[PDB]
Amino acid sequence: PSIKLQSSDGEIFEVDVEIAKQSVTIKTMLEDLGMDPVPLPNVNAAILKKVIQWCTHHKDDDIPVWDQEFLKVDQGTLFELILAANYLDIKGLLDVTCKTVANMIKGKTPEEIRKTFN
Amino acid sequence: PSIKLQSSDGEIFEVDVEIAKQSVTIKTMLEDLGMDPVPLPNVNAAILKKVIQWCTHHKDDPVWDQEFLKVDQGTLFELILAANYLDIKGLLDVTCKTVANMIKGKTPEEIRKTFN
Amino acid sequence: WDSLPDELLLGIFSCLCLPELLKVSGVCKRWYRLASDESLW
Amino acid sequence: WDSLPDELLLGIFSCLCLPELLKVSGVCKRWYRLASDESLW
């Protein structure tokens, strides 16, 4: 079964409900509210595409190597991913992304931390 | 499980490996070569996304198709080419019938114009 | 619609009822040429 | 970080082994407050 997810900027993504369901909130909307175009006003297309990619890879579910490479994005995209994971309530995504930022903090001085994150 | 498909224009699509069950072309590339990122030089991201959308909907195999194919004529033409390239028989079949239905009941004049 | 090789064009035309090929034959020379194809009858 | 809600910062800090929080606390105003979060100790 599949549903359409609509980003804040209007891109429509046809998604397997088995993939979409890792978002606890979308899961309830699709299964219970039965929402045709599931609107997601706070996630843009670029980030939604990445969230869907992650969900697609993790649909069958230390940072796994695949996630480390997936998260090798710029800092801004990483923070947007954290936000989107939070917004959509995708725990696994939230975890790996927060872990990734945590690793940028480990073994560094407060001074080095200020620098990398501004 | 997911694998990466790469459109002709460089966009990566993380797709359920089950799509292989629908695209013989992708299946060959996956199984017979490896190709972590499976390159599809004959399909652009826009059409690839639509193809993936049609496969996703049809993974469990029509009115849904009629709605899905109720799109731009050049897009319809690109879908036929992509179904052929990717060897997704069911997509190819419904897209050619869709085109035939635009021919059916019309005169050569309209036909020339509509597909003009 | 010319970027489709003849094979795909015949795929489309083969969906039509025979008499309907009279319409496709007057559309274009390629169409005229493909509509009489030995395999559509 | 101009935008992560504090609850999300705690999520990041929760991934650090305790001694590590000393580093976080020495970064800035907010970090010092959250590093002292009941939920971490």
Curated annotation (Swiss-Prot), chain B:
InterPro entries: SKP1, SKP1-like, SKP1-like_dim_sf, SKP1/BTB/POZ_sf, Skp1_comp_dimer, Skp1_comp_POZ. Residues 80-116 are annotated as: Interaction with the F-box domain of F-box proteins. GO terms for cellular component: centrosome; Cul7-RING ubiquitin ligase complex; cytoplasm; cytosol; nucleoplasm; nucleus; PcG protein complex; SCF ubiquitin ligase complex. GO terms for molecular function: beta-catenin binding; cullin family protein binding; F-box domain binding; molecular function activator activity; protein domain specific binding; ubiquitin ligase complex scaffold activity; ubiquitin-like ligase-substrate adaptor activity. SUPFAM superfamilies: POZ domain, Skp1 dimerisation domain-like. Pathway: Protein modification; protein ubiquitination. The keyword Transmembrane does not apply. GO terms for biological process: chromatin remodeling; maintenance of protein location in nucleus; positive regulation of ubiquitin protein ligase activity; proteasome-mediated ubiquitin-dependent protein catabolic process; protein K48-linked ubiquitination; protein monoubiquitination; protein polyubiquitination; protein ubiquitination. Essential component of the SCF (SKP1-CUL1-F-box protein) ubiquitin ligase complex, which mediates the ubiquitination of proteins involved in cell cycle progression, signal transduction and transcription. In the SCF complex, serves as an adapter that links the F-box protein to CUL1. The functional specificity of the SCF complex depends on the F-box protein as substrate recognition component. SCF(BTRC) and SCF(FBXW11) direct ubiquitination of CTNNB1 and participate in Wnt signaling. SCF(FBXW11) directs ubiquitination of phosphorylated NFKBIA. Belongs to the SKP1 family. This is S-phase kinase-associated protein 1.
UniProtKB/Swiss-Prot annotation, chains C, D:
Phosphorylated on serine and threonine resudues in response to DNA damage, promoting 'Lys-63'-linked ubiquitination of NBN. It is found in: Cytoplasm; Nucleus. Residues 1-41 form the F-box domain. Substrate recognition component of a SCF (SKP1-CUL1-F-box protein) E3 ubiquitin-protein ligase complex which mediates the ubiquitination and subsequent proteasomal degradation of target proteins involved in cell cycle progression, signal transduction and transcription. Specifically recognizes phosphorylated CDKN1B/p27kip and is involved in regulation of G1/S transition. Degradation of CDKN1B/p27kip also requires CKS1. Recognizes target proteins ORC1, CDT1, RBL2, KMT2A/MLL1, CDK9, RAG2, NBN, FOXO1, UBP43, YTHDF2, and probably MYC, TOB1 and TAL1. Degradation of TAL1 also requires STUB1. Part of a SCF(SKP2) complex consisting of CUL1, RBX1, SKP1 and SKP2. Component of a SCF(SKP2)-like complex containing CUL1, SKP1, TRIM21 and SKP2. Interacts directly with CUL1 and SKP1. Interacts with CKS1. Interacts with ASB2 which is the substrate-recognition component of a probable ECS E3 ubiquitin-protein ligase complex; ASB2 is likely to bridge the formation of dimeric E3-ubiquitin-protein ligase complexes composed of an ECS complex and an SCF(SKP2) complex. Interacts with the cyclin-A-CDK2 complex. (Microbial infection) Interacts with hepatitis C virus/HCV non-structural protein NS5A; promotes the ubiquitin-mediated proteasomal degradation of NS5A. This is S-phase kinase-associated protein 2. It comes from Homo sapiens (Human). The chain holds residues 97 to 137 of 424 of the full protein.
